A paper describes a structure:
BET proteins are chromatin-associated factors that regulate transcription and chromatin remodelling. BET proteins bind chromatin through their two BDs (BD1 and BD2), which specifically recognize histones acetylated on lysine residues. The BDs from C. albicans Bdf1 (CaBdf1) share 31–46% sequence identity with human BET BDs and 58–66% identity with those from ScBdf1 and hence are likely to bind multi-acetylated H3 and H4 tails. In conclusion, Bdf1 BDs are required for the viability and virulence of C. albicans and can be selectively targeted by small-molecule inhibitors without compromising human BET BD function.
Author numbering: 383 to 490
Write the structure that this text describes.
């Protein structure tokens, strides 16, 4: 697993993305996609791997990431999956870009 200092930073980062400070645009990403509610039955077979912020937090807590780059890859996957299913200009697409910008600022 990643070193202690990077683990702390990644924990802070995922908590930031999930924070109530961003409640108006992180809600689509906190938990697994509701494929029934969204009428996207083949979602899991289309995306490379499904992912959500809560699962990233749980994977981090179980020491699943070898380094912080691997943590970043899962964050990017959340947003890649967003844009694959939500066209540019739509509400959820824009929320994804806004939350990804929060990540980019923290990660820079």
């Amino acid at each position: 697993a990643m070193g202690a200092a990077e683990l702390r930073f990644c924990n802070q980062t995922i908590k930031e993305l999930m924070s109530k400070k961003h409640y108006n645009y992180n809600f689509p990403f906190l938990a697994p996609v509701d494929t029934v509610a969204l009428n996207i039955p083949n979602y899991n077979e289309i995306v490379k791997q499904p992912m959500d912020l809560g699962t990233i937090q749980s994977k981090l807590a179980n020491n699943e990431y070898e380094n912080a780059d691997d943590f970043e890859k899962d964050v990017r996957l959340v947003f890649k999956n967003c844009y694959l299913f939500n066209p540019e200009g739509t509400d959820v697409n824009m929320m994804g870009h806004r939350l990804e910008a929060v990540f980019d600022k923290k990660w820079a």
